[PDB]
Amino acid sequence: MSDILQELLRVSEKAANIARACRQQETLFQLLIEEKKEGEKNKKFAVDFKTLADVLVQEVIKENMENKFPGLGKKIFGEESNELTNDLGEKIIMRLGPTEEETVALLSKVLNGNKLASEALAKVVHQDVFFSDPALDSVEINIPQDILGIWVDPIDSTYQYIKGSADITPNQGIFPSGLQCVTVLIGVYDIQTGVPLMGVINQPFVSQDLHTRRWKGQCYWGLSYLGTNIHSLLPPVSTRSNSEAQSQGTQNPSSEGSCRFSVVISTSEKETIKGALSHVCGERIFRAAGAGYKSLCVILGLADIYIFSEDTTFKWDSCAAHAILRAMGGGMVDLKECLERNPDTGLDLPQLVYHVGNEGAAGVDQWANKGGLIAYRSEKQLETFLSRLLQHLAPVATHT
Ligand SMILES: [Mg+2]
Numbered sequence: 001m002s003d004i005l006q007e008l009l010r011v012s013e014k015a016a017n018i019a020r021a022c023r024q025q026e027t028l029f030q031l032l033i034e035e036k037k038e039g040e041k042n043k044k045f046a047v048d049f050k051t052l053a054d055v056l057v058q059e060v061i062k063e064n065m066e067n068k069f070p071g072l073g074k075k076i077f078g079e080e081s082n083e084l085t086n087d088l089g090e091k092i093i094m095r096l097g098p099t100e101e102e103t104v105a106l107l108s109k110v111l112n113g114n115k116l117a118s119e120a121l122a123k124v125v126h127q128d129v130f131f132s133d134p135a136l137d138s139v140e141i142n143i144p145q146d147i148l149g150i151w152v153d154p155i156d157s158t159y160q161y162i163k164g165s166a167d168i169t170p171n172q173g174i175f176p177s178g179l180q181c182v183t184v185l186i187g188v189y190d191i192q193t194g195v196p197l198m199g200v201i202n203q204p205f206v207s208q209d210l211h212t213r214r215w216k217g218q219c220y221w222g223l224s225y226l227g228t229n230i231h232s233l234l235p236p237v238s239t240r241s242n243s244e245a246q247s248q249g250t251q252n253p254s255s256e257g258s259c260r261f262s263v264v265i266s267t268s269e270k271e272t273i274k275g276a277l278s279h280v281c282g283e284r285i286f287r288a289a290g291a292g293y294k295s296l297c298v299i300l301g302l303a304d305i306y307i308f309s310e311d312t313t314f315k316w317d318s319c320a321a322h323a324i325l326r327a328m329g330g331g332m333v334d335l336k337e338c339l340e341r342n343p344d345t346g347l348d349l350p351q352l353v354y355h356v357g358n359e360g361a362a363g364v365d366q367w368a369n370k371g372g373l374i375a376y377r378s379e380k381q382l383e384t385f386l387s388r389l390l391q392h393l394a395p396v397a398t399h400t
């Protein structure tokens with residue numbers, strides 16, 4: 001009925017325009033940063049423009065949603081706070097408004113009086129984008145607003161966003177780094193069961209015209225509310241570009257030859273645990289930056305599995321992506337719990353859940369995915385991968 005999802009799409013686009021604008025409006029390009037932000041527990045307010053563009057994007061989505069579905073805005077949680085410390089040590093509460101006491105006047109206090117940088121940004125946070133399909137007269141679903149909580153990651157991969165590389169070549173379709181790794185993640189889960197229901201991934205930086213220098217981006221979405229529904233898989237990678245431009249070509253990675261001979265695996269820049277088994281089916285493991293980008297590789301079919309072994313992924317990083325993945329048959333299951341309860345001794349209960357915190361132990365790092373994750377799109381592919389049998393893995397040709 002009134003889709004919260006079509007709105008999450010216009011608004012993720014409005015977040016992407018801010019994310020691009022800070023690189024495109026010449027003046028804004030200039031306020032970059034210096035250090036890797038997170039001495040997190042004791043209030044660690046470290047890198048100034050990064051955190052400003054972050055808080056701003058979280059705020060624009062919170063408020064444009066407050067403004068279209070009243071009541072929603074208090075159920076929108078995320079990684080950023082909506083407060084920044086400025087130069088002088090003053091804590092500033094970021095409210096733009098709708099019809100506003102100028103966002104300009106608010107940004108001036110964070111930007112030391114910078115009337116120019118203030119106005120470049122307030123202009124783009126208030127530009128109205130119209131962005132509208134594919135679930136218009138099609139997936140007319142109603143979900144009771146009282147059961148819905150939202151997890152936002154405003155600009156995922158801040159290192160890559162800040163390093164700014166526009167020129168990296170992808171190994172096999174997977175970008176190891178670059179602006180292509182940055183995503184806007186907006187996940188919607190069920191407050192009582194914890195289960196992701198709907199998701200929007202927007203990559204702001206997909207194609208750049210090198211003559212014109214402008215970037216175009218792609219937006220992906222899914223919904224699993226007993227009906228399961230998804231974005232026509234499609235980024236301009238495998239469509240217009242040298243491929244499905246004839247009639248109905250749908251047999252590229254997203255549809256690729258069912259299953260049988262090889263695992264493709266993506267892992268982070270810093271991943272330090274293992275690898276699978278070559279003469280069984282492969283050892284195509286790729287490094288790729290972006291927690292949301294690596295999930296997107298699994299969604300798109302470029303990778304089969306995404307494994308992250310440490311505790312440094314959080315709910316905002318996985319929720320949007322886990323929901324699109326559920327709408328296609330996949331999910332995200334906790335890593336340590338699979339490594340303990342060998343897979344089928346109690347089945348889909350180690351799917352990540354997003355309503356509960358972890359013991360209130362770390363205080364502030366209440367919302368981490370503790371013993372890592374494995375994101376997958378086919379449970380058959382997941383059941384193959386986990387079969388790395390210690391004490392019997394030297395038969396590298398596991399018939400079963
Ligand atoms: Mg971020």
Ligand SMILES: [Mg+2]
Pocket residue numbers: 079153155156157317
């Ligand atoms: Mg993040």
